[PDB]
């Protein structure tokens, strides 16, 4: 089912010793749980340009060894691991648990090898397995999640974030851009000392006057695409109007401080729900392609 | 023609005495003058979530009696009155005057029963009849209109707003978000002491630094969908680029002060003009669904 | 090929002596290099309303003589020159050089006659020929370009902007809204004292707190449509997410200071790439129609 | 008695026909009610420079005729109301003296500017204007650390109570009592307190919307005691001189009916080693820009 | 010795049962360690007006019982700690005196407010609170131009070192040494220096997020010397009185454990011609709003 | 004559080879033209603390060799130009004295910092630099309440007229005359007046874009008289000390050619009860951060 994906992942050479005490490198793979079988996002992202908002450039490599560039050239090595699902191994459509353990292995592999995992696409359950993987290899390390979502997503006890909280696994969590808050959410937001920046807060209180995010701990970044306004990311199953611009998000992302990025999860993208140009290119693919690129930049250039 | 709609409306139980000196409740109906017969907005709005931007929840009821929830639970009772036009009573397509008197009755009924009327869909002529209805039952009460529109809409002497002004019916009017101002408009804006916030004013002067709207009088809120940027609400017959985000509008809405809301009119939505996702959901329906919800919130939580 | 266009352009009466020492008038034409043969933008713009953001009105005239309105009525005379390409002269599709010399003549003609040229549509090469034309008639005059683009567009030595720089033709250039900056770009940005406002700068540093653009020299305004966010102008071959709102651009445009506008170039629009409403109207056409109108306003009302 | 002062005022030539449909001119005099006989402020201002914050210049004249120039600012010096017996006027003597003086100057076409005093000049000058122009509506922009409407004797409270004002704006209050709030409610007065201004960020106050003729009243104690200590009953946490200068610039209206700068007590000032007081330096600046406003107010 | 002062404090009636689950009441006393025997501040504040910046009013009582009212603010005046032999107490005499006094007042249900001194009152008052409530966590909001943690003798450094604080916020520092930064690192203290505040724009500081009981400590030298010159070792480029007033308003928390206003030296003040000091006017204002905070703190 | 002062300056060891391609070092001296013989400022600053606003520290040396350290800030004290006969130097004596002194210190590799005076030090120091480095272009950032270019005798007007400057920035002007505007036009000088700064909101001034070597000139009267009253001809509505501190921080450039802090007159100051002047406290702070800028200027 995923075999082909995990096999080469296991055959990935660990990061070189030349990478002495410096951030990176970044391993990138496609994850498609809860989403239709056609997952263009990973493939779409790779064809997109390399130049970033900040003055640096991505370099994507299908194979190792990932050489460490001089701490000055501003290249950003990224290991393409391809799509987790092999769109050839029959028409088998993996289970929830089948997706979890598949993702769990990839992250456990890439982390032990020293790479910073960036899952792309999916329904956000990758956030769960990727975080549990990290605390498995680094039980001492504390983790804080900056979670971009229009939904606080902690009501359902099965929700990836709520689970992490329930299992006493997080040092803290920041909820950026919520605009659909329920009674259950408020209760959980109370019970768990959760810092949160709802939309009316962000927009009315400053916009530019965003004092960054003070984080002293390794950071996991998870971005539900519906955090963006439906006019920027319409390819979502649960859209809520009054969201972030792509620029809005790009800004807040840059202000995330911390020692290291434990991993990154960009999800919520459904191609059957997108808004397409006349050349059949979707708005949300254009939006999320940018965000993924700058997410990788944060993994390479995060600080405190 | 509308008969079926008005009949049950007449059979609506007045607000209970339990509602002692407190805001609400809210009655909601569909109005489709000047728009194609298929009016999904009302139906689309009802299927949308109940949780609001601010920490409260809507409750929609097809029937009375609308019990008053404890002044703490944060539920927001809404009486669904359904679509004014009965899409079954032949293919008769009502007249301008036929729409006016139909709307006029509904508002007169719901107001005497104590409900706050919220018209949804249409071309904005509901604003005219709903306001005249209020001043009919409350001739002593002064009224101020916060009017969201890309067009000042007071040039044509037949325009609902201009008529209200011409008939000496308003204590004042605020024009938010205009970006197509004609010579005739400026003349009328002069003649009638009209306060107004054009787009370049709003955007350049603050954005966040919006000192709210100081209103001492009962407020009618009318929102032409074209006040929003065509990228947020493309389903408009007269789009003008450079408008409000859904967030932009949501913000300014929250800063509307006053004793009570006399009524709310959300209009300008044309489904034949919308931009649709691949699952045939329109951008403007997603946008206006949010706005309607928060409009209802203002009726329940307005102050000075 | 273009003959029909240039012929009447040559037969255009020069601006009257009544236009004593005052800004304008404005000549407008359609330019389609690098774009599909169907170029609706010019035609779409003309059907759009006349009223501006600022309190003035456009007047479009197919023929002279362009009378000077009293310095108070706030009318803005615009000479429609029509589409450069005659969509009738066979299916001949002009060359790069064929487009350059065609454009070069039109600008040279209209400038000597006293008009301010505004090219509409195309791939931005009109910027090159229009500027060289101006310095041909006014070799003493210094020129500064305010360039709106998501790409700095100076890497390729053939690029219109880079060429102008390389040929020592500009007093200065301002690059507004870049978000894809390469190594080559940074080198050229260094070598040529180029002032520039990237997207993260604009958005994080102020937004409203934009101290205008201090220009002491005649200004050429060139606007690649991709400076706008793909949600506002998706009809671009190279979209980059995280761009300007139409409002964003409108704002920054207003803050352009200078003695006179040497010319205006609005380009980057590809109808085969647009996002269309259900009535087959494209988002980018709605956006750029507004921008073109306000661009004309700047030519008539620029100052220092 | 003031005797000599009124003589000069009564003998003042009316504004020229060249002045038709132009703002101004400005009549300036010294008023010392509630303050010690030594009132240096008028003299100190006159000694102060002529160039303004905005790019224009004052021109001061002890006598007419005040000709109208094409970017200069003509000012008629009318001198000190009280002349040097040892007469110490009563409240009514100061009132009727000011009321008469202002009534003259208004008819002459000038814009009256009272300097010094305890703020009672505001009462007589507004009453003077509304006596001559009952058709005109009047709005007062009042700069003060105190709402100054508790005491029924207060010039403002009186003006409000006699149904004489279309509205009042209270800028920079930071000592509001229960009684103050009561009066603020019934007379429906807009007000921008100190905690408000600073929290709202001072810069994003472009202006104050106004369509009626404006009277400007500035209790010196609106400024922080570190900028204007020469005040009876000072309240800390006030405006910088720039803060006030800024907010003044944003005052809109057709015309200025008059200006009253008061609250200055030299026996309470903080003096440099050369015996120049901080408050005299501050208020000298403020007065100059008030005059500029009289010449350049608009909507 | 203080003798008489403690007598009154020990004989203070505890808070009424009407006060149950309401913030307050407030106990107020004068503390003069490190300062000359002439300590006018307490008396000066008491003479100052009662109306606050926010719309409420103080009510001062020399004796109980302090009844709980439905928008008034009850304040218990406990008077000057030192009574007029020529006894000049030692550091330990001031410490044990304050420590005892505060321990009493806390048990009585009152919120202690020390006035005057050198900031050593902060030490004893926090220690008093944590002595009675070891379960309670404590966070200190510290206004000072100096981080004041270099000297191991400093009240703050001691409090931190004894593992007594959940956290500390240092607002308005503008003289930070290498040693200061070292201590700031290991004890993980949040701090908002002067260059930060102004560059971040003062207005967009809505509040400071806090869930634990708060002690407020205000070294007077945090204000610019032009607002509070009566300080030993002044540092220019500080807060306006409004600036401080603003930042104070944004202090969040369940309850105020106590307040210490210090750094005031009358021999160093700048005086008006009527011998009233600038710093007394400034700090009199600040003290009033601190009391309002004790009554209206929340989250 | 200055005699002794120049002796020390001429005998100053040049900057070490360790200093190669590093900003600094800094030479500091006292200059007293146009001011009374009692010039406490230099001594007062030297007595003031060493820690800066930004996290670094000054180290002051009366003599060399000034070794280059890996976050300390070496400062060479050159002392008072005038030594205690009763000689009172002429304009030319102060000019040629300063011009010679600065020419030496520049060749030694040091960055000259004049302290005190009437602003004529700006003239000689710039002339000194352009005498040694005609290839270098120079831009002056000038802090002043007066554009100070009306008088053809003014140091700035002279510098401009002799075609010696690539550009000039005038920050904080609030008294602009017709003649000033004329000179501002022809010499094309950028300027940020007071009404501009405050209306533009002070916080959103990240920096000033500049690619040429910078001379920093600070007339003390740019600050509000409530912060710096010790100035001849004060103008109200100026910068807070923080305001100036902030704007200074945003000065960009490759190197600082020199710094001139002037306008301080102790006979005009406002003194605390212990006879310490407000302006000495303010300007002592400002001088320290100027030195930090010399060490940390960039683009
Ligand atoms: Mn979501
Ligand atoms: Mn409209
Ligand atoms: Mn481009
Ligand atoms: Mn007062
Ligand atoms: Mn201190
Ligand atoms: Mn000066």
Short mmCIF file of N, CA and C in Angstrom, two decimals, chain F residues 102-212:
data_model
loop_
_atom_site.label_atom_id
_atom_site.label_comp_id
_atom_site.label_asym_id
_atom_site.label_seq_id
_atom_site.Cartn_x
_atom_site.Cartn_y
_atom_site.Cartn_z
N UNK F 102 39.94 68.37 15.99
CA UNK F 102 39.19 67.35 15.25
C UNK F 102 40.01 66.73 14.12
N UNK F 103 40.81 67.56 13.44
CA UNK F 103 41.68 67.08 12.38
C UNK F 103 42.68 66.05 12.89
N UNK F 104 43.23 66.30 14.08
CA UNK F 104 44.13 65.35 14.72
C UNK F 104 43.41 64.03 14.98
N UNK F 105 42.33 64.11 15.76
CA UNK F 105 41.59 62.93 16.21
C UNK F 105 41.09 62.05 15.07
N UNK F 106 40.77 62.65 13.94
CA UNK F 106 40.30 61.90 12.78
C UNK F 106 41.44 61.09 12.17
N UNK F 107 42.60 61.71 12.05
CA UNK F 107 43.79 61.05 11.54
C UNK F 107 44.24 59.92 12.47
N UNK F 108 43.94 60.07 13.76
CA UNK F 108 44.30 59.07 14.75
C UNK F 108 43.36 57.87 14.63
N UNK F 109 42.27 58.05 13.89
CA UNK F 109 41.32 56.98 13.63
C UNK F 109 40.09 57.07 14.50
N UNK F 110 40.07 58.05 15.40
CA UNK F 110 38.97 58.22 16.35
C UNK F 110 37.78 58.95 15.74
N UNK F 111 36.60 58.74 16.33
CA UNK F 111 35.40 59.47 15.96
C UNK F 111 35.14 60.59 16.96
N UNK F 112 35.26 61.85 16.51
CA UNK F 112 35.17 63.02 17.38
C UNK F 112 33.75 63.28 17.90
N UNK F 113 33.64 63.54 19.20
CA UNK F 113 32.36 63.90 19.81
C UNK F 113 32.48 65.18 20.62
N UNK F 114 32.03 66.29 20.04
CA UNK F 114 32.02 67.56 20.75
C UNK F 114 30.86 67.63 21.73
N UNK F 115 31.11 68.21 22.90
CA UNK F 115 30.10 68.28 23.95
C UNK F 115 30.00 69.71 24.47
N UNK F 116 28.79 70.25 24.47
CA UNK F 116 28.58 71.64 24.83
C UNK F 116 28.82 72.55 23.64
N UNK F 117 28.63 73.85 23.84
CA UNK F 117 28.86 74.83 22.80
C UNK F 117 27.58 75.39 22.23
N UNK F 118 27.70 76.15 21.15
CA UNK F 118 26.55 76.79 20.52
C UNK F 118 26.23 76.21 19.15
N UNK F 119 26.90 75.13 18.79
CA UNK F 119 26.64 74.46 17.53
C UNK F 119 27.61 74.82 16.43
N UNK F 120 28.58 75.66 16.77
CA UNK F 120 29.61 76.07 15.81
C UNK F 120 30.65 74.97 15.65
N UNK F 121 30.66 74.03 16.59
CA UNK F 121 31.55 72.87 16.51
C UNK F 121 31.23 72.03 15.28
N UNK F 122 29.95 72.00 14.91
CA UNK F 122 29.49 71.30 13.71
C UNK F 122 30.23 71.78 12.47
N UNK F 123 30.42 73.09 12.38
CA UNK F 123 31.09 73.70 11.24
C UNK F 123 32.52 73.20 11.10
N UNK F 124 33.31 73.35 12.16
CA UNK F 124 34.73 72.99 12.11
C UNK F 124 34.96 71.48 11.97
N UNK F 125 34.13 70.67 12.62
CA UNK F 125 34.29 69.22 12.56
C UNK F 125 33.99 68.64 11.18
N UNK F 126 32.97 69.18 10.51
CA UNK F 126 32.63 68.72 9.17
C UNK F 126 33.71 69.16 8.20
N UNK F 127 34.13 70.41 8.35
CA UNK F 127 35.19 70.98 7.52
C UNK F 127 36.49 70.21 7.69
N UNK F 128 36.75 69.76 8.92
CA UNK F 128 37.92 68.95 9.23
C UNK F 128 37.88 67.64 8.46
N UNK F 129 36.71 66.99 8.49
CA UNK F 129 36.53 65.70 7.84
C UNK F 129 36.66 65.81 6.33
N UNK F 130 35.99 66.80 5.75
CA UNK F 130 36.01 67.00 4.30
C UNK F 130 37.36 67.53 3.82
N UNK F 131 38.15 68.04 4.75
CA UNK F 131 39.51 68.49 4.44
C UNK F 131 40.40 67.27 4.25
N UNK F 132 40.19 66.26 5.08
CA UNK F 132 40.99 65.05 5.03
C UNK F 132 40.44 64.02 4.04
N UNK F 133 39.13 64.06 3.80
CA UNK F 133 38.49 63.09 2.91
C UNK F 133 37.53 63.73 1.90
N UNK F 134 38.08 64.43 0.90
CA UNK F 134 37.27 65.11 -0.12
C UNK F 134 36.48 64.12 -0.98
N UNK F 135 36.92 62.86 -1.00
CA UNK F 135 36.24 61.83 -1.76
C UNK F 135 34.93 61.44 -1.09
N UNK F 136 34.94 61.42 0.24
CA UNK F 136 33.75 61.08 1.02
C UNK F 136 32.64 62.11 0.87
N UNK F 137 31.42 61.64 0.65
CA UNK F 137 30.25 62.50 0.70
C UNK F 137 29.75 62.54 2.15
N UNK F 138 29.12 63.64 2.53
CA UNK F 138 28.67 63.79 3.91
C UNK F 138 27.21 64.22 4.00
N UNK F 139 26.46 63.57 4.89
CA UNK F 139 25.09 63.95 5.18
C UNK F 139 24.95 64.23 6.67
N UNK F 140 24.27 65.32 7.01
CA UNK F 140 24.08 65.70 8.40
C UNK F 140 22.64 65.47 8.86
N UNK F 141 22.49 64.71 9.94
CA UNK F 141 21.20 64.62 10.62
C UNK F 141 21.17 65.65 11.74
N UNK F 142 20.31 66.65 11.57
CA UNK F 142 20.30 67.81 12.44
C UNK F 142 19.05 67.88 13.30
N UNK F 143 19.22 67.72 14.61
CA UNK F 143 18.11 67.85 15.55
C UNK F 143 18.07 69.26 16.12
N UNK F 144 16.97 69.95 15.86
CA UNK F 144 16.84 71.36 16.20
C UNK F 144 15.39 71.80 16.09
N UNK F 145 14.99 72.73 16.95
CA UNK F 145 13.65 73.31 16.87
C UNK F 145 13.62 74.41 15.82
N UNK F 146 14.81 74.85 15.43
CA UNK F 146 14.98 75.87 14.41
C UNK F 146 15.73 75.29 13.22
N UNK F 147 15.23 75.52 12.00
CA UNK F 147 15.94 75.07 10.80
C UNK F 147 17.36 75.62 10.76
N UNK F 148 17.55 76.78 11.39
CA UNK F 148 18.88 77.36 11.62
C UNK F 148 19.67 77.52 10.33
N UNK F 149 19.05 78.12 9.33
CA UNK F 149 19.70 78.35 8.04
C UNK F 149 19.35 79.72 7.49
N UNK F 150 18.62 80.51 8.27
CA UNK F 150 18.27 81.86 7.87
C UNK F 150 19.52 82.73 7.86
N UNK F 151 20.16 82.84 9.02
CA UNK F 151 21.41 83.57 9.16
C UNK F 151 22.51 82.94 8.31
N UNK F 152 23.07 83.70 7.36
CA UNK F 152 24.18 83.23 6.53
C UNK F 152 25.42 82.89 7.37
N UNK F 153 25.39 83.28 8.64
CA UNK F 153 26.47 83.01 9.57
C UNK F 153 26.32 81.65 10.25
N UNK F 154 25.11 81.11 10.22
CA UNK F 154 24.82 79.80 10.81
C UNK F 154 25.73 78.71 10.25
N UNK F 155 26.26 77.86 11.14
CA UNK F 155 27.18 76.77 10.77
C UNK F 155 26.62 75.89 9.65
N UNK F 156 25.32 75.60 9.73
CA UNK F 156 24.67 74.75 8.74
C UNK F 156 24.55 75.44 7.39
N UNK F 157 24.01 76.66 7.39
CA UNK F 157 23.87 77.46 6.18
C UNK F 157 25.21 77.59 5.45
N UNK F 158 26.27 77.84 6.21
CA UNK F 158 27.62 77.91 5.65
C UNK F 158 28.02 76.59 5.00
N UNK F 159 27.87 75.50 5.75
CA UNK F 159 28.20 74.17 5.26
C UNK F 159 27.47 73.83 3.96
N UNK F 160 26.18 74.14 3.92
CA UNK F 160 25.38 73.95 2.71
C UNK F 160 25.87 74.81 1.55
N UNK F 161 26.02 76.11 1.81
CA UNK F 161 26.40 77.08 0.79
C UNK F 161 27.75 76.78 0.13
N UNK F 162 28.70 76.26 0.90
CA UNK F 162 30.01 75.94 0.36
C UNK F 162 29.98 74.62 -0.41
N UNK F 163 28.78 74.15 -0.75
CA UNK F 163 28.59 72.93 -1.50
C UNK F 163 29.32 71.76 -0.88
N UNK F 164 29.16 71.59 0.43
CA UNK F 164 29.99 70.67 1.19
C UNK F 164 29.22 69.43 1.62
N UNK F 165 27.90 69.48 1.46
CA UNK F 165 27.04 68.40 1.94
C UNK F 165 26.27 67.72 0.82
N UNK F 166 26.18 66.40 0.89
CA UNK F 166 25.39 65.62 -0.06
C UNK F 166 23.91 65.78 0.25
N UNK F 167 23.61 66.08 1.51
CA UNK F 167 22.24 66.28 1.96
C UNK F 167 22.16 66.58 3.45
N UNK F 168 21.01 67.09 3.88
CA UNK F 168 20.79 67.42 5.28
C UNK F 168 19.37 67.06 5.72
N UNK F 169 19.25 66.45 6.90
CA UNK F 169 17.95 66.13 7.46
C UNK F 169 17.67 66.97 8.70
N UNK F 170 16.55 67.68 8.70
CA UNK F 170 16.19 68.57 9.79
C UNK F 170 15.03 68.00 10.61
N UNK F 171 15.36 67.38 11.74
CA UNK F 171 14.37 66.72 12.58
C UNK F 171 13.90 67.58 13.75
N UNK F 172 12.59 67.77 13.85
CA UNK F 172 11.99 68.38 15.02
C UNK F 172 11.85 69.88 15.00
N UNK F 173 11.90 70.48 13.81
CA UNK F 173 11.70 71.92 13.68
C UNK F 173 10.27 72.29 14.03
N UNK F 174 10.10 73.42 14.71
CA UNK F 174 8.77 73.90 15.05
C UNK F 174 8.69 75.42 15.02
N UNK F 175 9.74 76.05 14.50
CA UNK F 175 9.73 77.48 14.24
C UNK F 175 10.35 77.76 12.88
N UNK F 176 9.55 77.65 11.83
CA UNK F 176 10.05 77.80 10.47
C UNK F 176 9.61 79.13 9.87
N UNK F 177 10.58 79.93 9.44
CA UNK F 177 10.29 81.25 8.87
C UNK F 177 10.23 81.19 7.35
N UNK F 178 9.85 82.31 6.74
CA UNK F 178 9.79 82.41 5.29
C UNK F 178 11.16 82.21 4.67
N UNK F 179 12.17 82.82 5.28
CA UNK F 179 13.55 82.69 4.82
C UNK F 179 14.04 81.26 4.94
N UNK F 180 13.69 80.60 6.04
CA UNK F 180 14.04 79.20 6.25
C UNK F 180 13.55 78.34 5.10
N UNK F 181 12.26 78.47 4.78
CA UNK F 181 11.65 77.73 3.68
C UNK F 181 12.35 77.98 2.35
N UNK F 182 12.76 79.22 2.12
CA UNK F 182 13.50 79.57 0.92
C UNK F 182 14.80 78.78 0.81
N UNK F 183 15.56 78.74 1.90
CA UNK F 183 16.82 78.01 1.93
C UNK F 183 16.58 76.50 1.84
N UNK F 184 15.54 76.03 2.51
CA UNK F 184 15.16 74.62 2.46
C UNK F 184 14.82 74.16 1.05
N UNK F 185 14.24 75.06 0.26
CA UNK F 185 13.90 74.75 -1.13
C UNK F 185 15.13 74.58 -2.02
N UNK F 186 15.97 75.61 -2.08
CA UNK F 186 17.11 75.63 -3.01
C UNK F 186 18.16 74.56 -2.69
N UNK F 187 18.43 74.32 -1.40
CA UNK F 187 19.42 73.32 -1.01
C UNK F 187 18.84 71.92 -0.86
N UNK F 188 17.58 71.75 -1.24
CA UNK F 188 16.90 70.45 -1.23
C UNK F 188 17.21 69.60 0.01
N UNK F 189 16.72 70.04 1.16
CA UNK F 189 16.96 69.35 2.41
C UNK F 189 15.70 68.66 2.92
N UNK F 190 15.81 67.37 3.22
CA UNK F 190 14.71 66.62 3.81
C UNK F 190 14.56 67.05 5.26
N UNK F 191 13.32 67.09 5.74
CA UNK F 191 13.05 67.58 7.09
C UNK F 191 11.80 66.95 7.67
N UNK F 192 11.86 66.62 8.96
CA UNK F 192 10.72 66.04 9.66
C UNK F 192 10.33 66.93 10.83
N UNK F 193 9.42 67.86 10.57
CA UNK F 193 8.97 68.80 11.59
C UNK F 193 8.16 68.10 12.67
N UNK F 194 7.83 68.85 13.72
CA UNK F 194 7.18 68.28 14.90
C UNK F 194 5.75 67.83 14.64
N UNK F 195 4.97 68.67 13.96
CA UNK F 195 3.57 68.35 13.70
C UNK F 195 3.51 67.10 12.82
N UNK F 196 4.51 66.94 11.96
CA UNK F 196 4.63 65.78 11.09
C UNK F 196 4.87 64.50 11.89
N UNK F 197 5.94 64.49 12.68
CA UNK F 197 6.31 63.34 13.50
C UNK F 197 5.15 62.80 14.34
N UNK F 198 4.47 63.69 15.06
CA UNK F 198 3.41 63.29 15.98
C UNK F 198 2.18 62.79 15.22
N UNK F 199 1.85 63.46 14.11
CA UNK F 199 0.71 63.08 13.30
C UNK F 199 1.00 61.77 12.57
N UNK F 200 2.26 61.58 12.17
CA UNK F 200 2.68 60.33 11.55
C UNK F 200 2.84 59.21 12.57
N UNK F 201 2.69 59.53 13.85
CA UNK F 201 2.87 58.54 14.89
C UNK F 201 4.35 58.18 14.99
N UNK F 202 4.93 58.49 16.14
CA UNK F 202 6.37 58.36 16.35
C UNK F 202 6.89 56.93 16.21
N UNK F 203 6.10 55.96 16.66
CA UNK F 203 6.54 54.56 16.64
C UNK F 203 6.84 54.02 15.24
N UNK F 204 6.01 54.37 14.26
CA UNK F 204 6.24 53.83 12.92
C UNK F 204 7.28 54.63 12.13
N UNK F 205 8.37 54.98 12.81
CA UNK F 205 9.54 55.50 12.14
C UNK F 205 10.64 54.49 12.42
N UNK F 206 10.73 53.46 11.59
CA UNK F 206 11.71 52.41 11.83
C UNK F 206 13.11 52.98 11.76
N UNK F 207 13.36 53.76 10.71
CA UNK F 207 14.68 54.33 10.50
C UNK F 207 14.68 55.42 9.43
N UNK F 208 15.86 55.98 9.17
CA UNK F 208 16.03 56.92 8.07
C UNK F 208 17.03 56.33 7.07
N UNK F 209 16.61 56.19 5.82
CA UNK F 209 17.45 55.53 4.84
C UNK F 209 18.64 56.43 4.50
N UNK F 210 19.85 55.88 4.60
CA UNK F 210 21.06 56.64 4.30
C UNK F 210 22.26 55.76 3.97
N UNK F 211 22.98 56.14 2.91
CA UNK F 211 24.14 55.39 2.44
C UNK F 211 25.47 56.13 2.60
N UNK F 212 25.41 57.38 3.05
CA UNK F 212 26.63 58.18 3.18
C UNK F 212 26.99 58.40 4.65
#
